[PDB]
Amino acid sequence: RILKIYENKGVYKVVIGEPFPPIEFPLEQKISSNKSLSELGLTIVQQGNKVIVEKSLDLKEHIIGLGEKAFELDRKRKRYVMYNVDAGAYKKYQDPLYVSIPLFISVKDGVATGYFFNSASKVIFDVGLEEYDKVIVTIPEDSVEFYVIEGPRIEDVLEKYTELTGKPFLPPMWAFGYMISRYSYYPQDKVVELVDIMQKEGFRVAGVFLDIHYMDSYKLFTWHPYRFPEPKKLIDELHKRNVKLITIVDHGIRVDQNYSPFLSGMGKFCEIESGELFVGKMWPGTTVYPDFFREDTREWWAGLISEWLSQGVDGIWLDMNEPTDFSRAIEIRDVLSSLPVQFRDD
Amino acid sequence: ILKIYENKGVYKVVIGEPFPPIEFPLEQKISSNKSLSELGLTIVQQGNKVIVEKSLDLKEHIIGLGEKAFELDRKRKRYVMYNVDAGAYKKYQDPLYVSIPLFISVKDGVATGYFFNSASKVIFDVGLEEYDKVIVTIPEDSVEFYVIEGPRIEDVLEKYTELTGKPFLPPMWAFGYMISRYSYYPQDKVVELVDIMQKEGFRVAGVFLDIHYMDSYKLFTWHPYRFPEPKKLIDELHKRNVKLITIVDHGIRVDQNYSPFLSGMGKFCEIESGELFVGKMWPGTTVYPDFFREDTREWWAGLISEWLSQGVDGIWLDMNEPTDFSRAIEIRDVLSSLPVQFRDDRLVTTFPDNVVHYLRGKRVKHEKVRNAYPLYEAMATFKGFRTSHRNEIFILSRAGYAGIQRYAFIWTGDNTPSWDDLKLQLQLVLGLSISGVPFVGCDIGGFQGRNFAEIDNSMDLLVKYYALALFFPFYRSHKATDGIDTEPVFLPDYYKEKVKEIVELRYKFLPYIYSLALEASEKGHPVIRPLFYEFQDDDDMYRIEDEYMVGKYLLYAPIVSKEESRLVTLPRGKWYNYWNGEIINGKSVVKSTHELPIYLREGSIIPLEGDELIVYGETSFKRYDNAEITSSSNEIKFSREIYVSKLTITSEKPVSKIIVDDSKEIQVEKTMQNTYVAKINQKIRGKINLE
Amino acid sequence: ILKIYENKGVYKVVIGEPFPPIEFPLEQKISSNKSLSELGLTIVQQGNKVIVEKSLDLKEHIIGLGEKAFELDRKRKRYVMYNVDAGAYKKYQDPLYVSIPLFISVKDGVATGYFFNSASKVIFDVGLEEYDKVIVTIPEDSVEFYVIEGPRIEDVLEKYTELTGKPFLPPMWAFGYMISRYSYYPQDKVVELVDIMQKEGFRVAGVFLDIHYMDSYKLFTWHPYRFPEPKKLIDELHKRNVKLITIVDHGIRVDQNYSPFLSGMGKFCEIESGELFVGKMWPGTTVYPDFFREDTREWWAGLISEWLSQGVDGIWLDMNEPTDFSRAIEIRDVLSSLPVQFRDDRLVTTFPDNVVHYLRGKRVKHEKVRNAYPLYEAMATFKGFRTSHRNEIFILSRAGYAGIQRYAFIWTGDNTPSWDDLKLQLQLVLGLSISGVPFVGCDIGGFQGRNFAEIDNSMDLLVKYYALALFFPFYRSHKATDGIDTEPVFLPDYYKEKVKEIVELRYKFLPYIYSLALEASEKGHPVIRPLFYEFQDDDDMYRIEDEYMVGKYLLYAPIVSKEESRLVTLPRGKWYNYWNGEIINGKSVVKSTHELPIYLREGSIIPLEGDELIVYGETSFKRYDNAEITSSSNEIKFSREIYVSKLTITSEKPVSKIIVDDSKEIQVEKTMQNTYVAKINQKIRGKINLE
Missing domain, CATH: 2.60.40.1180 (Golgi alpha-mannosidase II)
Incomplete structure (x- = not known):
């Protein structure tokens, strides 16, 4: 059992065991803290490959955060699951969704305090559900590092939290303009025709998004030979009309013998426990996925992106990157397709 | 074999040799000369079934049947009378938790009641199978039913109440504002909430404690960590003038060291083959007391009395349809894997077909007496209060059968918050009310929390719930575990004030409501009433369901929409607008003038x-x-x-x-x-x- | 953590901090001066698992593992040690009813034993995963096992028996001819059959009464109509010098008025969550006594003693794997409608994973101590005889674990009659025998009746069963309910005479058999032995399975074919043909000269x-x-x-x-x-x- 607490400019870094963070966050001026878990109002328990962190919850206490949740802003009375998932045609009160920000802020007596658990696993935030007077956080790992971020203002917590995890990049002003998109706009001449009508009728269009129909058989970094024969012409036309072009880019690399990205990416794809490549299903059909956790895979991908950008593409729209895979679903469909039964959408 | 008796306008028709779920006393069984044809009835005895037929005219109204998720005039539907855990019920779902095999026919302005005393799966086919007929099917070879002469609907209910039992007279605090949740805990939080409520001006009559207070859901136990000091909790609530009502289920945990299991041995339900009926409920593996037996009832009364002696003020009987989850869990274990969606068959939550009971010494199948189970449990619980020499009795039950009014209040179960539910709840409570169960209500704010998308937790809807139930006998706010906090103290000032005023208005009218409660316990007259109860001769009244009479004098047309006003249908006679004093002539439609459309009749x-x-x-x-x-x-x-x-x-x-x-x-x-x-x-x- | 002790040729290897199913006394255990590598073992502690490895040479022989439907030399197979109701088992089916985690290695003529004292699902991978290795996997984070020095196979068994317990000495009548069926009834028919058997010249030592004698399969009860006068049945059999053995299962019916259920309360098995483990068995809904507890054992001993006091002579413990049918029945209730075939999974008949027991005061999971359940039930039953001051003890058990020999005989369960079964039974009884359980036998004539096509009920096969078991310690004829009558008295004169002579021959040799039984109870030497037991240095002997030694002097080569004579393999040394007096030189193959190939060694x-x-x-x-x-x-x-x-x-x-x-x-x-x-x-x- 290991428990170390560090402090630094209003941020307490609590270390349970020997954590292996999804990503490491720089905490420069970190110095050993004399603050105890008890003064911090926290209780910790290490069990079967799990860490449970408890905090009390008062009747008037407010709990906010947890990112993208289809629930009321004050999170009380619910057990939230932090696990990126393709939510489909999501409805309210559906959980989890596409994004997982393991951060919640407590506002007690007007004072805000943040709690950030740096684990990208299936973290559970039980906010006054299991125990009406408690916030119970379960991290499915034997070790974990989390942060108690002092306020007192909610803005103070976010400033410190942002300092810790990274400042938002500064995008260009046109990124906040009016964007038109569809799944999908094509062929290329129709894209320009629509932009013209929009502009002619008084709509200031900052950019147009191109969905998966622009690709050749949904293959990343390719142009459909019939719908987009002249990408250079398309791009010049949009730029002459001062309109940006944003292209969707998925994460699936088609398992194709003559598909360049598949051949150049070899060696940098995700694998399964037994050693083979993880082969799944996505838009392109049979697909493999780049292991973005590796520095070299990231380099290979940046190159692909850079090259794609050099044509004059202005933005990148990353989709299905939960990451999502359809092999299991298609598998169920292939075996029980005959049965006049209704599958449960899990 | 047919025998007909008459006495004080009640005809008791006996077919074959009936073995009633319960026996109702007849002051003087006098043989009658009335024939079935004079009563306008046709009877047929078939394969262990009795079919009773009555004609049905185009203008004839059929009301009653208790708790039904349908329009008050029951025509054009085949109703099933079988207590069942309806789950997150929606409108037009049948059957529900309560079964009152009574319907009243109003023909040419004259009311006549028909009560079939069978707690089996009775079928009421009201002009569905045969457009011009009411066909009642009792799945037993014998049966006893009653034709209750009117002519007023009130006359029928008086006679019916006389027959099955007068509603008990509860204490005035039972009609106060009750706060509840599934669940409030630990004990300190319970007191903290009560303090905030009182400090902010809400007069709380009592707090309900749901299953989280028990130790592993074991009946008659306190959770060792959430309720370490029950006596302190009880003293604190009383010190603050708040009553304590504890939920009590019907499942006895099959536990080697659980006292009730050991002391109840010999009094539990069995199955045909002789073993105990072992099922599944909150405590896990469980057995159930056979409440049809006197010794079981006595044993339970003692456990209740023991429980009440700590200072607990009321008993909340839940899951007493009776409900069991062994079959559902069973299906889930076998097809757990299979990526398929199951059909939610509510009847799967009832007791299996091989369960038996001992009624008046005779061994009988569960399906023949099912609906009366909650009646006997309530009876035993009531006896528990008598044993404690407790004059102020409060018992809430989810399920019921004819006669349940003798011992308990009834709430409409696990309703879903939505604008449509406002209308549904009205039909439910009025259905119960017109069927002999006066003390009723629904969960203010809706029970369902956030386990599915079709749940509306908006605050203006919550306010409308408080307003809707303004004159309901039972006024309680209850919410599922994962629901948002619905206590008024957590609402923004704007909405908090509205709830506060509504509650204060209810207390202002409490003396009237309680007087009607006395009337109910003496004459068997319902407290809240559908308009046709007071104006049964006006056919228009049978289509008005978003309005109700409080006693014989007050008409309330709650706003069940987002509008600022609504159209109000006024029956014959003059009506006094409580808020602005205007006197309008009855049999007209007017626009409301206040957020709470209240009118007093001349x-x-x-x-x-x-x-x-x-x-x-x-x-x-x-x-x-x-x-x-x-x-x-x-x-x-x-x-x-x-x-x-x-x-x-x-x-x-x-x-x-x-x-x-x-x-x-x-x-x-x-x-x-x-x-x-x-x-x-x-x-x-x-x-x-x-x- | 690793510790090794030694004492009189036995090395006790302790890995971690073991919690044995049972503790075996080790006298003057002193710290060992022999390392793991000198023992030729490799050990690895992983995810709640201990893996022990030993090399395996091409000529090395591996024997033991108890009741296995495989060749006596165990190489090239991954065996599972988990007591299970095998149903109508076939050859090569694994696992079966008994689990003896002991195997003996014979390398260069030297024998060494390896006993892993864990009653969990131990895996013995004998040269399957790795051709040159024996890999033993114990699903526990800790374990204690023993390396038992030889050099003779007999030396290993003597030490092993000394460690786990000497076989009890049963009465001579326990080795007599037993007749049984599922079942014989009513009581008058039992006596009638015994009379015909005796009148026709069959010396019947005892009769077994199967579950039909009970009232609704309730333990310790007599069927009110089939056995109205148990006391009379008992005296009638005794007057005929015939013992009475009654079957006793392990399921206590969950019945409100069933005495054992009420008196056993508090001593039954539970599930992790705290409730009683309620399952399904013959009586219907049932609970099971937690035999791992001392107080449960005293309670059971009392019921057994009380049962024995009527004059019952023996106890036949069945279904004690322990077996439970709740899962199997659950599947049939849910997938009943489907016209598909369920995959027959025998593991579904074991106790579910959430069952727990209290071993030496410590709460433990069923899967960790499962195999020892029958051991403790047999222990309690044995204690029942002691309580009755009964010196002549007879206990038959279907399941077992190391040490079961202290208290009971073991029969091979529900075998299927067929010519192939003759060979299978030989492997089964010899497997048990070479693994420390001396008193064994199979159902003469096969248990299975006529519920499937692959059952051979021919009379000449039946005779071969009687002949096959001629020298088996346990000699019983048993048949399923729908099987033809297999009692000799129902056979045509030709076959009846053959069975009669075989039985008479067994009684002629009974003094020898019983003397070997004494030897077994004193030294732990098995009664019937595979040839390699007496000639372990001859590799040829490990392939001979249709022959067996009775004690050290008699060699029997039963005819397990349709032929009139067979080839007989004779070990080194001189052999005397019992029937014709010819003396032949060992290490040769000769043709049999009689229907019962018997030879005596010099x-x-x-x-x-x-x-x-x-x-x-x-x-x-x-x-x-x-x-x-x-x-x-x-x-x-x-x-x-x-x-x-x-x-x-x-x-x-x-x-x-x-x-x-x-x-x-x-x-x-x-x-x-x-x-x-x-x-x-x-x-x-x-x-x-x-x-």
Whole structure:
């Protein structure tokens, strides 16, 4: 059992065991803290490959955060699951969704305090559900590092939290303009025709998004030979009309013998426990996925992106990157397709 | 074999040799000469079934059948009478938790009741199978039913109540504002919430403790960590004038060291083959007490009495359909893997077919007496209060059968918050009310929390729930574990104030409500009533369901939409707009003028909080404290000396003054159209004359 | 953590901090001075698992593992040790009812034993995963096992028996001819059958009563209509000198008025969550006694003792794997409608994973101690006999674990009659025998009746079953309810006579068999033995499975084919053909000359019924009554005065006469080659000399 607490400019870094963070966050001026878990109002328990962190919850206490949740802003009375998932045609009160920000802020007596658990696993935030007077956080790992971020203002917590995890990049002003998109706009001449009508009728269009129909058989970094024969012409036309072009880019690399990205990416794809490549299903059909956790895979991908950008593409729209895979679903469909039964959408 | 008896306008028809779920006393069984044809009935005995037929005319109205998620006029539907855990029920779902095999027919303005005393899966086919017929199917080879003569709907209910039992008289606090949740804990949080509620101006009569207070859901136990000091909790709540109502299920955990399991041995339900019926419920593996047996009832009364002796004020009986989860869990274990969606068959939650009971010493199948299970459990629980020499009795039950009114209040179960639910709840509580169960209500704010998308937790809807139930006998706010906090103290000031005023208004009218409760326990008259109860001769009244009568005098048309006003249908006669004093002529449609459309009918006397009094027209009324008030042309008589604070007199003719007992003359002030007020603030020995 | 102790050729290896299913006493255990590598073992502790590895050479033999439906040399298979109701088991099916986690390695003629004292799902991968390795996986984070030095296989078993417990000494009648069925009833039919059997010349030692004698399968009850007079049935059988053995299952019916259920309360098995483990067995809904507890064992001993006091002579423990049918029945209730075939999974009949027990005060999961359940039930049952002051003990068990030999006989369960089964049964009983469980047998005639096509009920096969089991310790005929009547008295004269002679021959050899039983209870030597037990240095012996040794002197090669004679493999040394007197040189293959291929090895002494005595060569032998007989050159000594009827002497050298105690002379008669008989009919103070 290991428990170390560090402090630094209003941020307490609590270390349970020997954590292996999804990503490491720089905490420069970190110095050993004399603050105890008890003064911090926290209780910790290490069990079967799990860490449970408890905090009390008062009747008037407010709990906010947890990112993208289809629930009321004050999170009380619910057990939230932090696990990126393709939510489909999501409805309210559906959980989890596409994004997982393991951060919640407590506002007690007007004072805000943040709690950030740096684990990208299936973290559970039980906010006054299991125990009406408690916030119970379960991290499915034997070790974990989390942060108690002092306020007192909610803005103070976010400033410190942002300092810790990274400042938002500064995008260009046109990124906040009016964007038109569809799944999908094509062929290329129709894209320009629509932009013209929009502009002619008084709509200031900052950019147009191109969905998966622009690709050749949904293959990343390719142009459909019939719908987009002249990408250079398309791009010049949009730029002459001062309109940006944003292209969707998925994460699936088609398992194709003559598909360049598949051949150049070899060696940098995700694998399964037994050693083979993880082969799944996505838009392109049979697909493999780049292991973005590796520095070299990231380099290979940046190159692909850079090259794609050099044509004059202005933005990148990353989709299905939960990451999502359809092999299991298609598998169920292939075996029980005959049965006049209704599958449960899990 | 057919035998017909008659007595005080009640015909008891016996087919074959019936073995009733329960026996109802007949003052004097006198043989009758009336024939089935004179009663307009046809009877057929078939394969272990009895089919009773009655004609059904186009204008004939059929009401009753208790708790049904349908329009009050029951025509064009085949109803099933079988207690079942309805889950997150929606409208038009059948059957539900309660089964009252009683329906009333109103033909040519004349009411006649039909009560089939069978707790089996009785089928009421109301003009569905045969457009011109009401076909009742009892799945037993024998049966006893009653034809209850009217002519008024009230006459039928009086006779029916006389037959099955008068509603017990609960304490006044049972009609107060109750807060509840699934669940409130630990104990300190319970007290903290009560304090905030009281500190912010909410008069809380009692708090309900749901299953989280138990130790592993074991009945009659306190959770060792959440409720370490029950005596302290109880003292604290009482110290704050708050009653404590604890939920009590029907499942006894099959536990080697669980006292109730060991002491109850020998009194549990069995299956055909002789073993105990072992099922699944909150505690896990469980057995169930056979409440049809006297010794079991006595054993339970003792456990209840023991539980009440700590200072617990009320018992909340839940899951007593009776419900069991062994079959559902069973299906889930085998097809757990399979990526398929199951059909939610509610009947799967009932007791399996091989369960048996011992009724009056005779061994009988569960399916023949099922619906009466909650009746007997409530009976045993009531006996528990008697054993504790407890005069103030409060028992809430989810399920029921004819006669349940003798022992308990009934709430509409796990409703889903939504605008449509406002109308549904009205149909449910009125359905129960017109069927002999007076003390009813629904969960204010809706039970369902956030486990599915179709749940509306908006605050204006919550306010409308509080407003809807304004005059319901049972006024409780309850919410599922994952639901947002619905206590008024957590609402923004704007909405908090609205709830606060509504609750204060309910307490202002509490004396009237409780007086009607007394009336219910004495005559069997329901407290809240559908309009056709008071105006059964007007066919239009059978289509009005978003309005209800409170007692015989008050009409309430709750706003069940997002509008600021609504159209209000007024029955024949004159109606006094409680809020602006305007007197409108009945049998018309008007637009409401206040957020709470309240009207008093000519010929009303309403007792208000603080000994206030409102008199309009001539009528005779009995207050909850037995004081009778009779108003006439220009005189108000009192059966005994009573103190009177403010007196409000609605009158189209000007009132200049009143004289108390032919001596002290009091000045009257006209506060608004047709409204005259008089500060009396004194005891009135016997009468008041108006001038 | 690793610790190794040693004592008298036994190394106790302790990994981590083990919590044994049962603790075996180790006398003067001293810290060992032999490392793991010197023991040729490799150990690895992983995810709650301990893996022990040993090398495996091409010529190395691996025997043991108890009841396995495989060849005696266990190589090339991954065995699972988990008691399970195997159903209508076929060959190569694994696992079965009994789990003895012991295997013996014979390398270069030297035997070494390996006993892993874990009653969990131990895996013995014998050269399957790794061709040159024996990998043992214990699903626990800790474990204690023993390396038992030989060098003889007999040495290993002696030490192993010393460690886990000497076989109890049963009465001689326990080895007699037993008739049984599922089931014999009513009581008058039981006596009628016994009379016909005795009248026709069959000496019946006892009759077994199956579950039909109980009232609704309730333990310790008599069926009110089939067995109205149990006391009369008992006296009738005893008057005929026939013992009564009653089956007793492990399921306690969950019945409100069933005494054992009420008195056992508090001592039943539970599930992790705290409730009682409620399952399904013959009685229907049932609970099971937690035999791992001392108080449960005393409670059970009391019921057994009480049951024995009526005059019941033996207890037949069945379904004690332990088996439960709740899962299997659950699947049928849910997938009943589907016209598909369920995959027959025998593991579904074990206790579910959430069942827990209290072993030595510690709460443990069923899967960790499962296999020892029958051991503890047998222990409690044995205690029941002690409580009754019953010295003649007879207990039959279906399941078992190391140490089960202390308390019970074991039969091979529900076998299917067929010619192939003859060989299978031999492997099964020899597997048990070489693994420390001496008193074993199979159902003569096969258990399965006629519920499937692959059942051979031919009469000549039935005769071969009787012949096959001729020298098995347990000799019982048992049949399923729908099977044809297999009692000899229902056979045509031709076959009836054959069975009669075989049974008479068994009784003729009973004194020898019982003497070996005494040997088993004193030294832990098995009664029937595979040939490699006596000739472990000859690799050929590990492939001979249709032959077995009875004690150390008799070799029996039963005819398990349709042929009239078979080939018989004879081990090294000289062998005497019991029927024709021919003496053949060992390590050869000869053709049988009789239906019952029997041979005596040079150096044998065999006590026969009626004080007969056969002596061939030089050797020493303790008769069951303690009388020791030593034969030398031309002299036979006796440890004490004993009576001798007929004396048969086999010798290649002519014998003309014998002298009794140096005085009296008796004429000898050469009946056949190498065979000389002498009718002594008198007591012999100390010796006999031959001239």
